[PDB]
């Protein structure tokens, strides 16, 4: 019965909200380290964000304390969370309604007062992503902790002395590259400061789902759109060609707009490339139309082809234009 | 070894759920200060309108009394909300099925009996939106709180005295202007009145999602149907075009019924001119099957002609009306 | 004080268990007043209805009671309910998995044993709605609410001595119509006997969505189907235009289903009108491809003439038939 | 009072985790009786049904043992959940995470010991459904409960003595047909046996939607596929109408998709019928393909002819097995 | 009253936090053994897996010691987890938010110790999904257990002394085949050594679903996309019947992108399927096109000869590929 000598020792009159500090002036050291194991969802409907990861926490505690020599080493003493004191960090823009932990229900300590509590958790954020550039895009995530309840006044939110944690985990659909965390001074009112822990997440769009399912159609009716004007008015499916790639272009935009999110910045390229081939459309039918009604000698051969022309600058410079992106 | 003893000598008796004040007829000026953070979403298929924010409160404890100059100063002490008496204040029209909380776990406490609690959550409220401007609308929310509990014959919900909170808070989507708060006597019934706050929350849509989303195609084919009856109906291709028209509109109604919520005030202009040019395209085909059913001497010259410049006017029009809003 | 010492002396042995009640044979009036304040939603999909609200609970208590006189009156207490004696009355058919209470963690008393317990919830139901009428239908919505674990031998459930409670809550999408409380005689079994009390809400369909998304375009097609007859046969665009309608009642058909519940009674006229307007596209493509196979004397002339009559008069009178619904 | 007096002196050593038996050997006699007051919803993607109903049981409880005789009557007393010993029967393949329950906190008591422990629960649960049928399908499936915590070293899991339970529970959307609940006696190995008890459900799917919603558009499809090939090759509109079904078709799919689920036995009969019909649109525009080839003597109309009987004969019979069923 | 009198002498100073072993060096061997009972889903739009099942524990007590000979037999008692020290296994990547038990409040104890501990749930996993051969794929994935807070220094996780758990879970939708599960050394860091038990399932997608919604429509347009070229430029329906192909397609495209999970890792063969018989049909496009455009002596039956042969044996030779591995 060793360890029940020891609990029972050292839950003398340990209340689990008293501030765990020998000086009450004096605040604690609190270090902190996040860690990301693997990226699940990213919703750009709600610029929502959820990973799965584990947050180190360290501080030393004063009231904790005893001589292992007489008390035959046990140095690591589980107790659970909620016979202990545990601090408030939180995340600032948790998306999930509740706080929620994964197995956070137990912390080892040490003889010495060193606590490597470590919970775990599937952290759902926000974060501002950059639609422009997508599918090709690199938009940044971030990830802040900090504390709301107390000020620093009470704890020193720091990060940890060793920084060996520069990892790249790479998905089959996501690359996730870590960035070193930095230590900010947030400021909640002018009399009262507070602090808050940083850190970045490469979100690289590996999948290759969002490309190959969206731009090579779009691709191809622009290409089916460029040899319109070779069809002779004449030919009756001209008009129904084109509307043809009318139906099939308002498809294409009703698929995106089922995918591509509401919540929008600014315009991306794969939307701006399908309305302006759908323009593309709208001119095109607009001269087919003038030249079958001027029709009714007919000089629409120079016309068409300075049409077919221009069509073929204006589609080589933007298609360019946009795989320099990629 | 100070803290401790405070907790001791000062939870002696403390109940959770006796009113804390001096004088049992006396009512306490609990003060409220509430402040939205960040707008996450605004789904009119239900008019929900989901923001986090922050909660600030108010209210000298008449039996939490000390001095510092006795005590070793720390006029600053943190006490979790389970042990303290705590407000029933809470919003009137929440969305979540429970009233959930975040990091609302501690709230501090001065000597003289001050405490700022500062709970944090993800309101999700209801409020009225003006979809008649739809897209380009400014629909106003309200965010409201108040005690369903207790009346004003027990508390006094105030506001705080700091009312400079003019913040601008702009978001990649909405952006979001405060209106500062005021209290208003709420009537539950006759015998009994109770007190609400209420604050008003601009939403303006920044998003360019709406727009490129629906106007353009529908305006550009709307131009398309308003160049149709230029071809001549020995072509065997006018009510091709025009039924090709048919299934394009019908896809954007479609995508429109599936995006544009359920819960209706006025119809949408948006809603409107899809509508409208969908009746377009039911008039010329009308009139294109009545001239083709005539032609099988050249007498549809003037009539068309009448046609495209009435279907013009009316067209300029309703452009320029539904550009009047923006 | 003066409160710490009345709830010290009251409540000695209250458990949260025992009947409130002198005589054991006895029962308790208790009272219930049921009152909606706002609707969230009818999803037809399960036949559910979320609305919000209050319900006002009454009963008395003999073992709990003093006398304000001598203790500087102050005959208003509030009591959270976890420490009071609670009756278990539930609503019958509720669609949350937990029947979850909203701020109802205090209870307002007085001295005489009439408690203002006053929860408040978003109470979720079924009830059964009428489709038939489908849009312009007036599903009447139905809230029971009793005791399942004890019956009358325990409690009473009445009503409230005051019945003004008739308020017309109308919303901008729906249209609510309060109707008074009535008491009725549940049997749980032969053996037996419960109680049941029951409001009725009358739902009027004040959506101007519904219509302008369904009745217009079903209604215009149906119009140009009427229309077809004119083409000649031998134009090659009749069954252009015939197979164009077919698209687009196909689509229209499609999304009707992804919005119209499965869950359903009698079929809707909205429904039958789409049946309706594909067996008009069967019926004149059958006769158009027959007159085609005959042309390639020219006797149909008789034949779409009465074949326009018979379709135009028919359609009129069912459309004047479903009119008459609305 | 009495019922205090009750209260405290039944419960002096009553600790919520032992068996409630006097002999150890011996085991206690639980009974069951489950019945549905009305089905929820019945999601075939993952083959949930949701049913709302309750639970009966019984079992003697050796600690409750008193006469009312000399307590002044009182044989009905009401004891919460929490403070006494409750069996752990449960649904064999619930869906919900957790087993909730619904008004769950209260149950009856009397000098004997019965207990009408009579918990309601919107109970999801997994049973197969066979989709062949569908919509003429009777698929049978079943609720089955047990104990996993302990054995029938422990337990009894019988049934009611009066199994009066000829109920048929009638609905709008379904209809339930109840079967006598039995009794298996599990093993799991020589050391371990379990038990189970079985009710079984009847599902007639009375739902009208489905059939308007499928199997009318595709009948009316294959109609005129049926009736098509009197379409000259010569009027260059047999294609555009082929490939018009084959859109029609193609739509078709993606609804039954959309609605039909992905976890499937046997393919659907009328998944099966529309697969059917657009290989028939595929194979008769194969031959119309080849005869506009070969065109450019018409040799055509005994081919089409022969065509036109083959292919009806096959539909005809086809349509007959289908609806041979009912 | 013996199971009273063993309760109060084992549970006399038994707190929950201290580790059951005599020798506080010692580790205890702790064996688990996990097993699917029934699979209900897996989406690989999140890459989860659901599947119903429970989990089997052993590890002897030191505390729990009692000898049976003295005490009437009776070597198997139920005492709930809620007060005896519990293992802390997790699932490394579970889904859901919380880490739920069901009915996992009850576990029986032997007099020597052994407990059978018999927790179940419905574990939602991640699971890796080698889509290449999608849908005639053989994805298997693995669930991991393992001690978040305590390391090998506390506890060792072992397996079971028997390993006769080959059985064959067969389902209506998918085949599951049990992996013998294996014993892996997770690292915490360098200097801390963890554990892990490994298992792993074979997923046989034996549902017809997917084979019948999209490969039979895919594969009976690519040959009618074959057999078209057939016909004559100059008969007014060649391009028509192609841009009937083209909307067919994106619809086809659209319900696959709809249901073919958007987190993809290689193309599945479906997908490039149908984007390669949209590169077909714009090849055949340019060349039916050139036909037309140069009729303005024909040639082109030798040019679309030559295409047909070269379509129809790379269509062949690919159809032959991908069907070979099935
Ligand atoms: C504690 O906070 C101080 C603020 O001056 C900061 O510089 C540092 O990161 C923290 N730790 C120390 C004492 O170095
Ligand atoms: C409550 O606050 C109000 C401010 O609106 C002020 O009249 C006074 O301080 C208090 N009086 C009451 C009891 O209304
Ligand atoms: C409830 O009390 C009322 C008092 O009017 C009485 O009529 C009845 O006995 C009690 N229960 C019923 C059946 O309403
Ligand atoms: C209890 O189960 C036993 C078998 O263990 C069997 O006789 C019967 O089904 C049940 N009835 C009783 C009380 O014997």
């Given at each position: 019965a060793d360890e029940k000598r020891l609990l029972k020792c050292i839950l003398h009159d340990y209340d689990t909200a008293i501030r765990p500090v020998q000086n009450v002036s004096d605040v604690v050291n609190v270090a902190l380290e996040v860690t990301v194991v693997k990226v699940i969802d990213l919703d750009e409907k709600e610029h929502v964000l959820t990973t799965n990861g584990w947050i180190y926490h360290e501080w030393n505690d004063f009231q904790l304390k005893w001589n292992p020599s007489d008390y035959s080493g046990l140095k690591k003493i589980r107790i659970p969370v909620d016979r202990i004191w545990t601090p408030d960090i939180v995340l600032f823009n948790n998306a999930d309604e509740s706080y929620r932990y994964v197995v956070d229900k137990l912390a080892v300590v040490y003889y010495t007062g060193k606590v490597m509590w470590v919970p775990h958790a599937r952290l759902r954020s926000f974060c501002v992503l950059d639609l422009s550039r997508f599918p090709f895009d690199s938009q940044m995530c971030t990830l802040v902790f900090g504390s709301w309840t107390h000020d620093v006044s009470s704890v020193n939110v720091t990060l940890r002395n060793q920084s060996k944690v520069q990892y790249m985990i790479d998905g089959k659909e996501w690359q996730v590259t870590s960035v070193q965390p930095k230590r900010y001074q947030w400021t909640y009112n002018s009399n009262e400061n507070y602090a808050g822990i940083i850190t970045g997440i490469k979100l690289k769009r590996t999948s290759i789902y969002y490309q190959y399912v969206f731009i090579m159609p779009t691709v191809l009716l622009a290409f089916l759109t460029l040899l319109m004007p070779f069809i002779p008015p004449l030919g009756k499916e001209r008009i129904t060609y084109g509307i043809g790639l009318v139906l099939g272009c308002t498809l294409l935009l009703m698929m995106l707009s089922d995918r591509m999110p509401?919540?929008?910045?600014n315009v991306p390229v794969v939307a701006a490339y399908l309305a302006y081939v759908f323009v593309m459309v709208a001119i095109n039918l607009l001269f087919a139309i003038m030249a079958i009604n001027m029709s009714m000698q007919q000089l629409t051969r120079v016309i068409d082809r300075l049409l077919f022309g221009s069509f073929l600058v204006l589609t080589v410079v933007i298609t360019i234009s946009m795989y320099a992106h990629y």
């Open positions: 509401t919540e929008l910045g």
